[PDB]
Paper text:
Very recently, another BTB-ZF protein, [name] (zinc finger and BTB domain–containing protein 10), has been reported to directly bind a telomeric variant DNA sequence, [name]. Unlike TZAP, [name] requires two ZF domains to fully recognize the [name] sequence, which represents a different mode of telomeric or telomeric variant DNA binding. Roughly, [name] follows the well-defined one finger-three base rule of C2H2 fingers, with each of its two C2H2 fingers recognizing 3- or 4-bp of DNA.
The G-strand sequence of the oligo is “TTGGGGTTGTA,” and the C-strand sequence is “ATACAACCCCA,” plus a 5′-overhang thymine on the G-strand and a 5′-overhang adenine on the C-strand to facilitate crystal packing. We determined the structure of the protein‒DNA complex in the P212121 group to 1.8 Å resolution, with the Rwork and Rfree being refined to 20.00% and 22.50%, respectively. The overall structure showed that each ZF recognizes approximately 3 bp of the DNA duplex, with ZF2 mainly interacting with G3G4G5 and [name] with G6T7T8 sequences. The positions −1, −4, and −7 residues (Arg767, His764, and Arg761, respectively) make direct hydrogen-bonding interactions with G3, G4, and G5 on the G-strand. Arg767 and Arg761 recognize guanine in a similar manner, with their terminal Nη1 and Nη2 groups donating hydrogen bonds to guanine O6 and N7 atoms, respectively. His764 specifically recognizes G4, with its Nε2 group donating one hydrogen bond to the N7 atom of G4. In addition to these base-specific recognitions on the G-strand, we also found that the position −5 residue, Glu763, contacts C5 and C6 on the C-strand, with its side-chain carboxyl group hydrogen bonding to N4 atoms of both C5 and C6. In addition to the recognition of G3, we observed that Arg767 interacts with T2, with its guanidino group making van der Waals contacts with the C5 methyl group of T2. Similar to the recognition pattern of G3 and G5, G6 accepts two hydrogen bonds from the side chain of Arg739, the −1 residue of [name]. Unlike the G3G4G5G6 tetrad, which was specifically recognized through hydrogen-bonding contacts, we observed that T7 and T8 are recognized mainly by van der Waals contacts.
Author numbering: 716 to 772
Write the structure that this text describes.
Amino acid sequence: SLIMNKLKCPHCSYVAKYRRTLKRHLLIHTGVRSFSCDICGKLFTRREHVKRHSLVH
DNA sequence: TTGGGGTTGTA
DNA sequence: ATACAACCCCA
Ligand SMILES: [Zn+2]
Ligand SMILES: [Zn+2]
């Protein structure tokens, strides 16, 4: 693309409105996930995903 | 159920 | 401005 917007994702067409949303989005462009369930070991990209997941246990 | 879009808050 | 968050909602 020829979008020079500083909030455009370098890896896909996504363009953020907020700097912190771009930061969050960039975490989908990696295999390393920062959060884990201490019961079953599953790995999640967002902290809120572990909270939602806890209903499993 | 999960991944990632939204809008949003605090320090 | 950045470092952590939050809940909602669709797919
Ligand atoms: Zn992207
Ligand atoms: Zn678990």
